[PDB]
Amino acid sequence: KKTACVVGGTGFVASLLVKLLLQKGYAVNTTVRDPDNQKKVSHLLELQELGDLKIFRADLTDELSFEAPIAGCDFVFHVATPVHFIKPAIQGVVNVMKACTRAKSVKRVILTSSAAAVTINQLDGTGLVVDEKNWTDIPPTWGYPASKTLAEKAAWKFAEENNIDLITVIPTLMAGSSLTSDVPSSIGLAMSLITGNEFLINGMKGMQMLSGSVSIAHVEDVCRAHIFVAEKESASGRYICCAANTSVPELAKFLSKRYPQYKVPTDFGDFPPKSKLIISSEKLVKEGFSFKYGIEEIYDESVEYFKAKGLL
Ligand SMILES: [Cl-]
């Protein structure tokens, strides 16, 4: 039986990964900052039924915290840029990876890092000063998916210097459903054209602009891609993971028609109807990975998830 460590198992990407590794027959160790917070870890507890799951207290600042959950594991998965519901992240990454240098069992470290995820978190912010023209004439920084965060740049140099086999996976706007109690922000952004939430619609516009694109994947495709590049020995480097590319206005038309039951706005004025960028997942697809979910499917599950959360 093989063992994998997933850091920060209460996250959106990380909890689903734990689940999928359990179903694939891995034993899984996961770390949470405080396991006694029973509301926070409830979904992890539920995963114990699926198999050999062990939950360790560990802290990203610490770096002696990681020796125990990582002991005996073949793979260590860490999400650097988790989705909400910089110097900390850089430091977490080096710290997990330092621990990994001492654990001779570790075959590969798999890091989740997206400059887009940082922008997505910031786009759904607080204290935004809104006026009469602000709300149309659209703080968040640039989130081009192909850009390397400093966290990521750190990992590659550390890996280069310490003979660690590192792979990075680069997701963009993730939707579908979550195992977490709170709704991840990414799903809110994605589902804004359906809820009609103008604030998060403005978010999606901001993303087209600051990310150069409106690209999307089901979180479950993103998690399977992590397991795939872990297991496939000749895999290397970085892997962008997204299923579909679009623009907000092109997307809104698509969803208008697929979901006539909902008041989907289609008139965007002179807002750019083509994005500057198309984000390609061809490298991942050529390694042998197939996406199980297309845009139709990403939205159905998200809709059903939003219903059950009483948001539709
Ligand atoms: Cl996440």
Per-domain residue ranges of the chain: 1-312
Distance from Cα 16 to the centre of ligand 1, integer Å: 9
Q: Find out whether 112 is annotated in a ligand binding site.
A: no
Distance from Cα 303 to the centre of ligand 1, integer Å: 20
Q: Find out whether 10 is annotated in a ligand binding site.
A: yes
Q: Specify the pairing of strand 75-79 against strand 166-171.
A: unpaired
Distance from Cα 137 to the centre of ligand 1, integer Å: 30
Supply the DSSP string of 246-308, one letter for each residue.
Answer: E-HHHHHHHHHHH-TTS------TTS-SS-S-----HHHHHHT---S--HHHHHHHHHHHHHH
Q: How far apart are CA 210 and CA 206, in angstroms?
A: 6
Q: Find out whether 30 is annotated in a ligand binding site.
A: no
Which residue's entry shows tokens 């699926």? 50
Distance from Cα 224 to the centre of ligand 1, integer Å: 14
What tokens appear for 270 in the block? Answer: 């002179």
Q: Which of 142, 91, 71, 80 is nearest to 114 (CA)?
A: 80
Q: Find out whether 272 is annotated in a ligand binding site.
A: no
Q: Which residue type does 296 have? A: E
Distance from Cα 82 to the centre of ligand 1, integer Å: 4
Burial class (CB in 10 A: 0-12, 13-18, 19+), 270: exposed
The correct CATH number of 1-312 out of 3.40.50.12780, 3.30.2010.10, 3.30.9.90, 3.40.50.720 is 3.40.50.720
Distance from Cα 14 to the centre of ligand 1, integer Å: 6
Contact in structure between 81 and 93 (CB atoms under 8 Å): no
Question: From which experimental method does this structure derive?
Answer: X-ray
Distance from Cα 298 to the centre of ligand 1, integer Å: 17
What angle do the packed helices 115-123 and 185-195 form, to 10 degrees?
A: 60
What tokens appear for 69 in the block? Answer: 């959950």
Q: How far apart are CA 138 and CA 123, in angstroms?
A: 12
Contacts of 141 (CB under 8 A, 6+ apart): 118, 119, 122, 210
Say what the resolution is, in angstroms.
Answer: 2.2
Distance from Cα 270 to the centre of ligand 1, integer Å: 33
Q: Which of 52, 45, 43 is nearest to 22 (CA)?
A: 52
What tokens appear for 7 in the block? Answer: 């850091």
Q: Find out whether 266 is annotated in a ligand binding site.
A: no
Distance from Cα 193 to the centre of ligand 1, integer Å: 22
Distance from Cα 300 to the centre of ligand 1, integer Å: 20
According to DSSP H, which parts of the chain are helical?
Answer: 12-23, 42-47, 67-70, 87-102, 115-123, 150-162, 185-195, 198-211, 219-231, 248-258, 282-287, 295-308
Q: Find out whether 79 is annotated in a ligand binding site.
A: yes
